[PDB]
């Protein structure tokens, strides 16, 4: 009983990103993400959700991506980022027979930061940089990247597993 979500973001520069990703419910592929930031495709492969719910979910994913891209631009604006770069986000929730939730971020294929939900705080996952410290400062500064995210993992994700498995 798990929802896993995987997003790879290909940045050619701060202002143009290509997304590719998918989600799996149980061990079954259920969603696909693809395309540039200015017109991203998001598909449920199986008709799991009704339109009013899918629209809210689709809108919610699109809103996340805007925040995600906005944060990458801010980090570039404030520290110098080396392009091209790829970012991988791996996240989701698992229901035991209380849910366990996670969100792990990698840059160019190496561990970068992850979310610790008991305090809704992000931590470094590498032992090596000004980029890492500024990103964590930004992620830990705003309600949207701590408490709203924790709720998405602990409430929205968990209700999706209960309703659709
Ligand atoms: C359903 C699946 C369909 C799509 C399948 C493909 C995978 C998509 C993965 C993304 C998951 C969606 C996240 C989401 O919707 O979160 C909202 C809130 O997020 C937030 O508020 C999070 C804000 C952004 C967090 C960014 C973390 C990235 C850190 C990396 C920084 C890199 C810096 C440069 C090196 C929900 O909100 P709700 O209201 O629906 O509940
Ligand atoms: C999901 O995307 C990853 C990353 O590109 C890919 O390696 C994997 O084969 C995809 N899996 C599914 C089930 O779509
Ligand atoms: C990521 O890898 C590309 C490919 O070599 C490189 O040009 C770029 O500088 C790297 N960026 C980071 C942030 O490691």
Residue numbers in the entry: 9 to 105, 109 to 139, 141 to 177
Verbatim from the authors:
EPCR is a transmembrane MHC class I-like glycoprotein primarily abundant in the vasculature of large vessels, but present in numerous cell types. Since its identification, EPCR has been mainly known for its role in accelerating the generation of the anticoagulant activated protein C (APC) and favoring its cytoprotective properties. Structurally, EPCR shares a notable degree of homology with the CD1 family of receptors, including the presence of a central and extended hydrophobic cavity suitable for lipid antigens, flanked by two alpha helices lying on top of a beta sheet. The presence of a lipid bound to EPCR is key for its biological functions.
For this, we performed a wide crystallization screen and obtained EPCR crystals in varied conditions, which ultimately led to solution of the structure in three different space groups. Crystals grown in other conditions yielded EPCR structures in two novel space groups, C2221 and P212121, containing 2 and 4 molecules of EPCR per asymmetric unit, respectively. Structural alignment against EPCR in space group P3121 yielded root mean square deviations of 0.459 and 0.400 for EPCR molecules in space groups C2221 and P212121. We observed, however, non-homogeneous signals inside the lipid cavities. Fitting of a diacyl phospholipid scaffold (lacking the outermost head group) satisfied the overall shape of the map, albeit with some degree of uncertainty for the orientation of the carbonyl groups. Despite the high resolution, we observed a less accurate electron density map in one of the two EPCR molecules in space group C2221, where the signal appears disconnected and fitting of a diacyl phospholipid results less satisfactory. The only molecule found in P3121 yield a ~ 1375 Å3 cavity while the two molecules in the asymmetric unit of C2221 have pockets of 1410 and 1540 Å3.
